[PDB]
Design a protein around this ligand. Structure first.
Ligand SMILES: Nc1ncnc2c1ncn2[C@@H]1O[C@H](COP(=O)(O)OP(=O)(O)O)[C@@H](O)[C@H]1O
Ligand SMILES: Nc1ncnc2c1ncn2[C@@H]1O[C@H](COP(=O)(O)OP(=O)(O)O)[C@@H](O)[C@H]1O
Ligand SMILES: Cc1ncc(C[n+]2csc(CCOP(=O)(O)OP(=O)(O)O)c2C)c(N)n1
Ligand SMILES: Cc1ncc(C[n+]2csc(CCOP(=O)(O)OP(=O)(O)O)c2C)c(N)n1
Ligand SMILES: [Mg+2]
Ligand SMILES: [Mg+2]
Lengths: 533, 533
């Protein structure tokens, strides 16, 4: 006969215990009980977005920067389906995002309820099943606690990923016992390497004449920046990153090879494909297409390929491994450090990036969209701070960075947050700067305004002999005016001097800002030629 | 040894035979062979949109207005997932929309390909399965013709609905035999009622003292407007429509009851729930929540319920039927006519709508979005022309009408096309007005700008005691400035006199136009109080 709360309040309180601070989303009729519970608790802050997709991107960005669980909510039917791309990006980047969706009342199942979201209508649980680690409808109020804890355990254990919890509106306000647990009670710790593997890796490094490390996005998921650095310095092993793993290692460090793979650096290409690397250590990379120059066989080391991954299904997928370590990257690096120590043995886009480099403070978190910004950002921007380069290459969704940067700023309010994005990507999700204006979230968007789809335009020229154009706008979008309409200060930049001033002004603001940069659509970005050939 | 074409060209030619005139979408690397084929044939025209969701909405609007198949295309991964909401609305409204998605080349399956869209990545085929009649990956170039015909047959047969065809990029340019068929060779006709059921309905009508017809959106799917009108006039039976079925029967006609159900008219409510209707004929309605005032038992007739539906699974779902006719609505009505004849026996939103009624030509196609616009359009606008009221109430996705109106105008270029939409819905998909500017598509958007989520705000007041606000913008969006930024002429209207002038100007343009109307968020729309109780 214990203390009761509503099922949806229990859910909110259990999220509190996980350190959730924001819920991104858009309300709707069957979702209102969740908002009622949030506003009654006055701890988690709801963020109203313009599109549920932007809500999901924001939760994804909040999660990646905070290292915590991101949470978004959407209503029945088209609310939840609008979130899908963002959940699919969290899925492809191994980001823990919880999507809470509403469901009609049980008494209306199979009758043609408004936005019915069951097997009889638009089956949200089945739609999200392929791109979540778990997609389930809460069957009864009594199971809310167990299912919530299950979702939280599943999102953040093993390879992190998103969760979809669907909540019938009548279940939401049923009374349940107030049963909230600390996170350590309902999820376990991280896997470590075996003693044998540590000793074998140590020995391989001791005898290696040209070892190398390829560090991927798993370094960020494992929060292993300081261990990777210590390990690299203790051994003298040079470190390349994958494109998405950029900022896992300080690119100004003497041991940094830069980025290997798409839009990468000749320094890394020469070191890793020259045939001289005898021991290659892959840490937290899935070794997909862009990470390997389309599975280039020259990546194969001459003595041993060591691959460290928390997901056992990634080990040896595309390259045969000699030491396949199923463990968390941070636990592995710590063990390796323990073993080795104890032993004792328009404007040219490049100018834009350069100008950004000269003005952005060192602690800036840089979000980069998908488009030619990828090449310019990955290739030309020097990332010195751990985790400060945020790019969603798993799915490479246009508009991801446009919205994710807002969630990032909420996760790191003390740090400058800048997003480098294309104009077509900004047309997809740029309305979200209104969300930044509404909540006074200071982010700076730099729009490479080349009047259309640059990467597609170059593909038409280089692969289809300019036979057709389905990439250039007849009239460019005026982002300054668009920003103005959404209540966000803006600057237009047609020269480097103009850009430098704009950036300078933007950084000093305590509100959001947009910089519309004039850029030529014909400019060939770094690495695209090789990619075309 | 007969002529061969590429698989993707075969697909384009087979869509030509179905009368497809536009393909809405956004290009991407694996999708480019489709665009190459389209541009080489110069009959189907590609329409570049701002978001793949807007492309799916446009295909949906094109399909509903044209009575033909709508086609949208998206690239791998996030391109396709961005379309999902629009496809889900086609599914909920029984609209034939074909979504063509690209897939990576087969040689990269399971290796971590860029935007890999297989079971090993983001599994598009399984994601779309719940909201399509068919979702399949073309396994070989040789099967392109059969799979295409299968898709076209499936979309437009039985209860119409959307299809997802996923095309591996390497298959796209393999040679295949040039084999194109007219639609009648690979899909059949419509089913008719049995003579026994026709005679039974005729007898029930001949003896009925207070008959009524409730006509739904199936009337449009069957293109049965003239047969419905002739049937009602022949029998003297008054006709109500469902909300979504509005414009299936001329609302100025002496036999019109108006709309029954959500935001409907008292005339229809009095007639149908009085208990005096003895024979009720439901034609092409799924009898969901809004169609039945939450399955009101008083809708039950006292003698006989007759239900006509092409989908046998809808017949008798929520109300027991006495005559359940599985047939096309147009074939059934023609049969009934043949039998009976042979026998021989801010600004207040209501003022906005009145001004629209006071200027719009009779042939105007009115798209109404989802939001309080539903209530104002359904209740206050008098629809006289068959099919000229276009509302997507199956899923009621915000932003649907914003984009669907562009496809509608392309389907009926000689007719005025106007969209009545809320400001939050325009923030979700309003960027598509740049698509209308790019192609010079004259559509008029009327934005009810109440500075936030009107229906949600009223729900907070009437169901949650104004305890919280997650609905009002701190600073409303300036849609005239946004339109200007996107190259679209615009007007701001704060009085009915300004609005009338704006509409007049808008109708005379041969370019798109946006009208930003000041509206009080507090006004209670017709039918809301009833829904609240
Ligand atoms: N905590 C962790 N420790 C080690 N590996 C991890 C951890 N979290 C995620 N991973 C792994 O890191 C990899 C990330 O791959 P991906 O997201 O494709 O980035 P990249 O583009 O750098 O390969 C996955 O193979 C995943 O299993
Ligand atoms: N050609 C047709 N003839 C008869 N009924 C049809 C036809 N096409 C679709 N239908 C039916 O019309 C109904 C449409 O229901 P719905 O889209 O919910 O509209 P409404 O809101 O008017 O009920 C479905 O039950 C579908 O099976
Ligand atoms: C949602 C989505 N649709 C399509 C693509 C395919 N795509 C990759 S780059 C590109 C063009 C991006 O244009 P813009 O953002 O203006 O950048 P630019 O390359 O011109 O700098 C497109 C459509 C994608 N990645 N995501
Ligand atoms: C994609 C989507 N998200 C959420 C909802 C829930 N919803 C119904 S009405 C409404 C408010 C719409 O606001 P606006 O378009 O400005 O219209 P208003 O009611 O203020 O006229 C919302 C969010 C929805 N129907 N579709
Ligand atoms: Mg561009
Ligand atoms: Mg509104």
């Amino acid at each position: 006969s214990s203390k009761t709360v509503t099922a949806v309040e229990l859910l909110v309180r259990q999220m509190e215990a996980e350190g959730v601070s924001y819920v991104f989303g858009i309300p709707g009729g069957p979702l209102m009980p969740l908002y009622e519970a949030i506003f009654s608790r006055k701890k988690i802050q709801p963020i109203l977005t313009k599109h549920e997709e932007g809500a999901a991107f924001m939760a994804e960005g909040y999660a990646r920067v905070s290292g915590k669980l991101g949470v978004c909510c959407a209503t029945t039917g088209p609310g939840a389906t609008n979130a899908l791309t963002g959940i699919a990006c969290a899925y492809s980047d191994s980001t823990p995002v919880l999507l809470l969706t509403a469901q009609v009342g049980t008494a209306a199942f199979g009758k043609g309820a408004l936005q019915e979201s069951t097997v009889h209508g638009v089956d949200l649980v089945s739609i999200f099943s392929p791109i979540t680690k778990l997609s389930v409808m809460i069957p009864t109020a009594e199971k809310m606690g167990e299912m919530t804890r299950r979702a939280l355990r599943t999102a953040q254990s093993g390879r992190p990923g998103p969760i979809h919890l669907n909540i019938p509106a009548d279940i939401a306000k049923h009374p349940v016992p107030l049963e909230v647990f600390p996170p350590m009670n309902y999820r376990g710790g991280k896997p470590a390497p075996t003693i044998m593997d540590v000793v074998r890796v140590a020995e391989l490094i001791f005898h290696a004449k040209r070892p190398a490390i390829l560090a991927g996005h798993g370094i960020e998921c494992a929060k292993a920046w300081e261990e990777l650095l210590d390990f690299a310095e203790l051994t003298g092993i040079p470190v390349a990153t994958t494109p998405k793993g950029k900022s896992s290692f300080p690119e100004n460090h003497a041991l940094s090879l830069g980025v290997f793979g798409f839009a990468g650096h000749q320094k890394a290409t020469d070191y890793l494909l020259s045939g001289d690397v005898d021991v290659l250590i892959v840490i937290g990379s899935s070794l997909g297409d862009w990470q390997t120059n389309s599975w280039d066989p020259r990546l194969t080391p001459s003595v041993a390929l060591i691959q460290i991954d928390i997901d056992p299904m990634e080990i040896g997928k595309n390259y045969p491994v000699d030491v396949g370590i199923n463990a968390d990257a941070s636990e592995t690096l710590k063990a390796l450090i323990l073993c080795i120590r104890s032993s004792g043995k328009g404007i040219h886009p490049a100018m834009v990036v350069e100008a950004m480099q000269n003005r952005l403070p060192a602690d800036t978190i840089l979000f980069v969209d998908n488009g030619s910004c990828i090449n310019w950002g990955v290739h030309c921007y020097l990332a010195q701070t751990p985790g400060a380069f945020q790019i969603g290459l798993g799915l490479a969704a246009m508009g991801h960075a446009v919205a994710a940067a807002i969630g990032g700023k909420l996760a790191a309010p003390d740090r400058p947050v800048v997003a480098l994005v294309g104009d077509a990507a900004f047309a997809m999700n740029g309305m979200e700067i209104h969300t930044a204006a509404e909540y006074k979230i200071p982010v700076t968007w730099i729009v490479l305004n080349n009047g259309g789809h640059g990467l597609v335009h170059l593909g038409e020229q280089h692969q289809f002999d300019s036979k057709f154009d389905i990439s250039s706008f007849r009239k460019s979008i005026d982002f300054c005016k668009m920003a103005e309409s959404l209540g966000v200060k803006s600057y237009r930049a047609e020269t480097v001097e103009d850009f430098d001033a704009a950036l300078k002004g933007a950084l000093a603001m305590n509100t959001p800002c947009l910089i519309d940069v004039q850029v030529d659509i014909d400019v060939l970005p770094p690495g695209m030629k090789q990619r075309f050939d």
